[model samples]
Structure formats: structure tokens, C-alpha cells
Target: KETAAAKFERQHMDSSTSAASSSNYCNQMMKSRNLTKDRCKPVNTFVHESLADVQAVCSQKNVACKNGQTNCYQSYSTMSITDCRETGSSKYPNCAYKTTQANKHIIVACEGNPYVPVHFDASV
Candidate 1:
């Protein structure tokens, strides 16, 4: 079975190429809007192994909970936490109880864009 890290790596590799190519189109869009290059950061694409993985990450960090006790998810090359209760409602009913545990998330960070990840420092 492929580990989550492996899957994330594979997805990041595929998306980076596409992002590099798409940068031109994005640049054009920025030019039309008269936005500076720095203001128009290149967006990265995201790929996940499963819906469960997505829910685990987004519910907790990416964006603020728009609805009470709910979280939202966004598509980006890097992993972020959003309220799972908001975006992955179907799964929330089953997994809400697990939220208290650390590493209860499956965040997907981009390999190319370095970002700090949630660390569960267990002595196991």
C-alpha cells in the first residue's frame, strides 16, 4: 500500500509541472488585471489519496470555520486545515469523536513549497 507521504509526493510532482506551464496563463490574467507579479503568486495544484485524508486536514487549520463547528476545504498545492464539519459533512458524523487526538489530520503539504507540518512527537 502507498503511504500518505508517498502519495503526496507523487501528486506534488505531477502538479508542479502543470503549475509551471499554467504560470504563463496566470501571468496573462494578472497582466489583464494590472496585478504585479509578486501579487500573483503561482498557485499549486493538489492531489490526495482519498477523501478521508482531505477531511482530516482541512477541518482544523486551512480556513476559519464559516459555520459553527464546521470547516471548509480549498484546493491548493500545499496542505492546509479547514473545518471538516463544514466541507466533509458526510464523513464528519462518523469521525467527529476523533478530533481531540493529535495528528487527527492528514494534511497534504507541497513538496516543492516547503511548509511546516503538524508534528506528533510520540516516542513510539
Candidate 2:
């Protein structure tokens, strides 16, 4: 039987390519919150080994922000692990492998607006 971690990984492994959507979400969140670019920056790059790791990262950090009038909210980009394969360039076979995945969740925390990820989760 697969371990819980393995099961989660298998179930949620997918690849994503939606940087534009992420950016749009960020913009919307900023506008709703009456915030400026100085307040937040677009998260252009993120990497995670597994779904659990991603969740752990979000949980640990202050991914959510709140304005004086609103409560704190947090958002996350969708992440999926695509596949694993040996590195063909490696001199030693089976020496190295890579797993490809995609993230669609966009975490947006605004001051006045609800701190929610503006981007919708898309299936790979």
C-alpha cells in the first residue's frame, strides 16, 4: 500500500502554466484592497517537492495579510507533480531524476480586502 504522503502526491500531482492568471489575481487583490505595488509583489517563482511540502510552507509563513478594517486571509497557488524520470544526461543511469509539477493557486493578501488568493484553482 502507498503511504499517506505518497497517496497525496499521486492524487495531487499535476503541471500548470498560468503565470498570467496569477498576475491578474494579484492585481485584482491589490485594487480591491486599495494597495499599491509597494505593498505587495508578485510571486513569480516557487518550488516544492510535494503537496505536503507546499502546504507546510504556506502554513509556516505569513501568507495572509489583513488591513485594519478587514481580517487576515491567505491564498495559495495550485501545485501538481507531473512525473519522475531519470536524468538522461547523467553519466550514471538512475543517478538522478526530476519531477515536474504545476502551481495554479495564487495567494493574495490585501489590506482592506479579504486576504484571499485571487486566482482560481485549475486542474492539470
Candidate 3:
């Protein structure tokens, strides 16, 4: 847990996603990471390997970022990430998430001058 510019998530693949992609992972995170005020937040987090492992991802895949890039990064390793696809119903503030684990290469978006991990690329 760091700042907007430097943060990383490390889950043992057994704990994750409370229907999460569309539910309350952020809710837990805001409090767990001290971003609180969980009543509202506009962010999402994912678990990969480590900082250096994650950082070097950029240099590996060179894939597009969350919104297609300016300076994005991707991992060569297929990592377990928490992403639940939409089944129906849309919008926000919906959480009845049934926690489940997932596996896939973690591809993330990044920013700043030197480039840093930000969010996950929907297309990654």
C-alpha cells in the first residue's frame, strides 16, 4: 500500500473479488488502504506479483493500457487478477459480491514522466 503514484496489491489468490468487478472491492480497499470515505471512490485495484515484477512488465509486453496508452505497461506473466464480467444490471453502488479468485496475466496502465502502474487495461 503506497500512494497514487506508487501502490501495489498482493493477494494470495485465495482472497479476492466480492462480485468485485462490479461490487465492493473498492469499499474494502478504501478502508483497508486508508482511502476510506468508502461511500464513494472512483478507483479499482488488482493483485499481481510484486513492484519490480510489475514494473518490469511494461518492458515485457509493451501492450496497450487501460484506455489505450500514452505510456502503459503489461506483464509477460499470466497473473491472477480479480475481474468479474457484467452479467446484467449496471451502474454503481451495487455490492453483493461473492468472493472468487481468478488467474490471468496482469496487464496494467501507468502514468507520469518515467511511467508508473496505475490501473488495469480492460483490453489487457
Candidate 4:
């Protein structure tokens, strides 16, 4: 079975490429990554950093997650990221998206024995 951490990586990690130069990035990625399979995922984020670097986030100081869990941690350094938001007119099966790229400290919720990131809580 695929773990939550692995699923998070599949949906959010894009370490090899930067979506900075592409206006259609979100549109293409959101669908290709299967985020649009059910209903359009209203929002999603892509992290442009090595898997090791992202995993290290679990070692950082703990912070409260969006759901009030204390397993979340903020990255020690800022990282390049792209936020994909669905356009208002977007419909299921043809999800439209807008991308916003930024460099920010990421906050992720970690879990499991090795404490890997399972969810992207927010970015600051």
C-alpha cells in the first residue's frame, strides 16, 4: 500500500523542474498528476527541492498544523514553490488552474516511524 508520505510526494514534489516560466503549468500538472481525477482539487502546491531536503523538515521544530495537530514543522530555509489554484470557471473533468510561484518557508505535517511529510499545511 502507498503511504500518505509517498502520496504527498507524488502530488506535491517536483524537484527536477520549475514551473516558473510556464503559465500553463498548473493546468497541465494538476491533471497529469491525477489531482483532477475526481473533482478538481481546489488548490495544490509543488515543491522544487530534493527529496532529502524535504524529508529533513520532519526534524525541525514542531508547529501546529491546520487541523491543530502538533506534528507539523516549518522548513529551516525558504524554497521555491508553485501554488496552483483552480479558476472560478473551472469545471470537473476540465479543471482550469492558475499558478503562482514564490520562495517561502514551508510547513508540512509529518507522520509515521521515520516521520515523513504527509500533508502540506501551508507556506510562510
Per-candidate TM-scores read 0.20, 0.22, 0.55, 0.95
Q: Model 1 segments beyond 4 Å from truth? A: 14-19, 22-124
Worst 10 residues of 3 by lDDT: 10-19
Against the correct fold, how does model 3 do in TM-score?
A: 0.55
Ranking by lDDT: 4, 3, 2, 1
Model 1: per-residue Cα lDDT at residue 114: 30
Better of 1 and 2 by lDDT: 2
1-124 per-residue lDDT for model 1 (tens digits): 7555454443222222222223243333323333332333223223223444443444344542334222333333343221111123313222211111111223333222233222211110
Order the candidates by TM-score, highest first.
4, 3, 2, 1
The CA lDDT of each predicted structure is 0.29, 0.32, 0.48, 0.91
| lDDT, model 1, position 77 | 36
Q: Pick the candidate with the highest lDDT.
A: 4
| C-alpha RMSD of candidate 1 | 17.6
TM-score, structure 2 vs. true: 0.22
Stretches off by above 4 angstroms in model 3 are 1-3, 7-30, 35-43, 84-96
lDDT (Cα, tens digit) per residue for candidate 3, span 9-55: 43212133322453555445444654333333333445534556666
